[PDB]
Amino acid sequence: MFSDFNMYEAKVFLKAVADAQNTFRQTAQQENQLARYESQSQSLLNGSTSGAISITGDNIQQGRNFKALKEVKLFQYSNEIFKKYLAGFDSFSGDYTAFKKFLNESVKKIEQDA
Amino acid sequence: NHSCQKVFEGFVSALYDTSYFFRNFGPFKATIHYATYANYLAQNWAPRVSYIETSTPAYTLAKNKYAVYIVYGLIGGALIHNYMLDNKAAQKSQQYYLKHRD
Amino acid sequence: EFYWELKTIYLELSRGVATSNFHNKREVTHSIIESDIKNSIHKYIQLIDDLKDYPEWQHKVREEIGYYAHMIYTSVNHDGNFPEIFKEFNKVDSLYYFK
Amino acid sequence: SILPPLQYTYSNEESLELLIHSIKGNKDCNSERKAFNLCRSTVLGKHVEPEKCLDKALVFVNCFQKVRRDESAACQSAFNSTLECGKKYSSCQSQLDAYLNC
Amino acid sequence: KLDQIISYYITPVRRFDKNLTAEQIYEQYQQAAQFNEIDAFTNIRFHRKFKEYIQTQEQSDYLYEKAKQISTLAQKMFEKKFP
Amino acid sequence: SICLESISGTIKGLQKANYVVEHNPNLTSEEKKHLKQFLVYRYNPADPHDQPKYVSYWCDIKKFPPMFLDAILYIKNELDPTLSIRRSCREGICGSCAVNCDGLHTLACISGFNRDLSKPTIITPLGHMFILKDLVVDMTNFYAQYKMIEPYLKRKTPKPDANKEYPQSPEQRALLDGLYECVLCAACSTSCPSYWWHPDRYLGPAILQQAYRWIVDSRDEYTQERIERIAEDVRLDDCQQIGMCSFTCPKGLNPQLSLKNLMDMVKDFRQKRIEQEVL
Amino acid sequence: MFKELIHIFRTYFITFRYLKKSNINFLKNLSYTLIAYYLIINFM
Amino acid sequence: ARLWWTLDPSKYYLKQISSGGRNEILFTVLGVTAAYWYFGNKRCEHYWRRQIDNCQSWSRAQNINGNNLTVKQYF
Amino acid sequence: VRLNLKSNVDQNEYPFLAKWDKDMRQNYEEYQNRIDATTYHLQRSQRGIAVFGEWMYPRYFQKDILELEVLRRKQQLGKIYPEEVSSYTQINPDIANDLNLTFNAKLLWPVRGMTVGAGFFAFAHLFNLPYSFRLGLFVLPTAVELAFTWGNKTSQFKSIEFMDYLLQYRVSKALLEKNAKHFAEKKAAYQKEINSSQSVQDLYNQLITLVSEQAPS
Amino acid sequence: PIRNIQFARYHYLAAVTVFTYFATRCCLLDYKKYYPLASVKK
Amino acid sequence: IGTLLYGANQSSKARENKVATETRKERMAKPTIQLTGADSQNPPFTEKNINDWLYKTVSITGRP
């Protein structure tokens, strides 16, 4: 055990450290959310302008140019990347350590292919 | 009072009639009688630890001379087992989480 | 139930005469209370008469229920319609409580 | 089921070391902690503008990292002795004070 | 009691490295919350896979960091692939 | 109907009479004060315009024997004949002249009026009892209380002699001594706090002492029956050993001690109902 | 304490005499049940 | 009286059954058995709780009308 | 801790944020004093011995943890505007009633209890009864209303949830004002080319799901 | 002959004490009144 | 009474079957998902993920 004053000081220091980590995370999340919102707005405007997506109030339907959509291209590229790199993904039934090893191998392979 | 004394008397008569009807209606009356018997059994025959040992010790059953000790031992064993189980569960949860933290 | 009605009547009579009853102090009883007391006295007389076949039961009833009647009678002055209210009680049952 | 659940699981040794380092930091970098608390006390720096208090938070975090390092040989020895005493606890105030004076 | 309260308070602290610095910790927190375009398609699969592998905050953080790094690499590849 | 008016009158009437707690009417008009002052409670509930009207009378103390009853008679024979009082023995033996003599419930016959001409003396009825006339209380509730106690010798079995006196040693007759001297003055009962709260449900100190005397009779074989009849509800449980019964007893009795004995018997009877009833 | 409180109520409060002993016995049982329930709830 | 506070059990409530003493061993056994099920659930729930935030535990809120919960900038 | 009453906000570009800062600075001192009192009480209880402390704590110190949390939440959000409460009524009605019974914003008399008591007085004047009995009956419904009103501790949880929602809404709104000038250029073109009142956050979720559903891949 | 009269007396006294402790919170007091009249640490 | 209870259970089962048929039709209304090469080599169909592809049309290559 220790003194109650020392316990209070340690609690204050730990709370301060936690608050600093929360502030760092909040700043990172705010910057990322602002960037993501700008990118989403730009993508929606480009899609609507190109005649690829028709927005109707709250529902959106594929348009005539839906094949040239950047979102469709991104989905196809993500599928290709997952197939070529994350072969065992959604099917790797190993433990937490096995999954971590597979993820590390996939990340290393992606960096090698980068 | 006044002509409203008729209203007061009528209200009294209506309340008395309602009380009599609710009391003397077969199903509710049987249920109330059963509930009264159950309440008498619960209150008058409550599980007290102390009771009249009127009979002589040569006729006293050993279950009564050991009832207090048995009850106290059961309560103490339950408390100790609960504390031990809580400590063991906390330690096992800590260990399992540390293994799973990896 | 009869004894409780008599006791409630007695408690109503005593309630307006208590020293702590500053809420309402009426010297003369209301006509409702007098009529209720008269009806209760008639009922008590009839019930006591019906208890003639059992002398012990009749004596017990006169001792128990009649005590409240004597208490009420002593709590009310014998003026005006008081004899009209106490006509039934003040025949034999009055002397039982030395009245 | 009323106490708050634990989010990040640390071992007993890690908790004792973190407590000792937090005591050392509160006894050493209290100025940095106060600066961080004051910068993170207003509504703006608390929720609206988190980027403003970034410098003070970084200073406090660097101070905490240096304190928990215990690079000095005397500090390391004192921390090891205090950790041994705390583990023996499964008292120690003198060892804690000796570690603090280092 | 006091030790239990201290442990409960310390439970919310992320266990970073002792030798690591404030700048490195902040960069790692920034890398975790990294803005990527192709992540939207990768995030769904990553979360679906990690839903059965997340029981502790530390494991969740590790898996999320790995997923975020992979997503950033994939976003860089996508940016290099389609001008 | 008359509820609001009654409430207003009772609130105001009590408010308008709180300051004037003593009307203190004067019998006549006088200036020189060579006579003692007596405030006699006058309450004639026969005419509608009549209420407690305690009158201040002045008369020479030496004009009559220094007795409360004698002074009351002198005032009621010469000054104010309208006053009424019950008194027959005039020797403190019948309990008839029990009155509130200077803040105490005592028989007026065996009493002494104050000789301090400066200090006026106030005499009123028995207290918490229906007042039939000025200083005349009605013991109708008390008298019925004597009927409930069954104050008669009850024999479960007869004596074999059939021609002589019941065998009673002097000590056994002494067990009833000091309880048979009660004059039934109802002074102890009138000052009993238990009867002041529950006059109907409580027999009273005098009734309890009479019941104890009847139960403790050597010849009577209904002591258990007397205990059973007494140990019902708050008939005896109302008494809380306050002690005003013995201090207000003009006969020198110990109603508090009699009540203590009766309560001890009742409590032992409850134990005897369990100790002596098992098989 | 319950019997003493009941006696005190029946002594000072004249209005307390309007309730019969059957209700008082139900009142005492209800008070005992409430006390037991409160004792259990404070520990549960 | 003037002193009624006693520590003895109630003479009316100190009764005993015709089959022996008061039914206490069975009642105590039932109480202990019920406690095991009762104070086995809170122990399981309290000691097996983990706090995890993964950006998916949050879900788009909806009003009591079921529509997506959105508040205008100027209310 | 001792935040200055004077806020350095511009008050000419982000008025909502300026008002929020002014409100936070206004009520910071009293809230801090109350929080300090509660924390001192908690520390003293922790310093207790056996049944008087350190044994039933913080389990028996339940009313103090919630009070401290509520005080902290009230310190974080300066002043609650009545207009914003009604928006929270979209999720939970009677939020204003819960806040009034929890934050002591105004006087809380037993209105329904007073009406019930006056109702019994009408019967008291019809079937003639003592005025003391009439007053007792009038107090009894009022007393029941007061008892049912005070002590509402779940209302404190509801108010905590409302305060958290309001804090989140204010944080989001303040962020909108800061980037309003920057996002002004995109807003006009987005409104011109996208006839949609729903948020783009859910709209993007629709487009992503549609692409994952029906796309040439 | 009341069996375990000491046990009954102890149970009654303990029940009274527990009822007083739980209903009045005498052992768990609030020191916020003396909080202003205190010396702050740190 | 037993027959009435069985009939009520059967009616509830019929309603549930109708709901499930509507859900399955909606799921099958999606276009076919190709599974060739590695997609066929390591199909995403998993026991924990089976609920994510029930009545979902795929076109997988393989050797029977």
Ligand code: SF4
């Ligand atoms: S016991 Fe004494 S005071 Fe009481 S009635 Fe008899 S003589 Fe009077």
Ligand code: F3S
């Ligand atoms: S004052 Fe009452 S307590 Fe008894 S002896 Fe007297 S009746």
Ligand code: FES
């Ligand atoms: S005249 Fe009888 S005692 Fe006074």
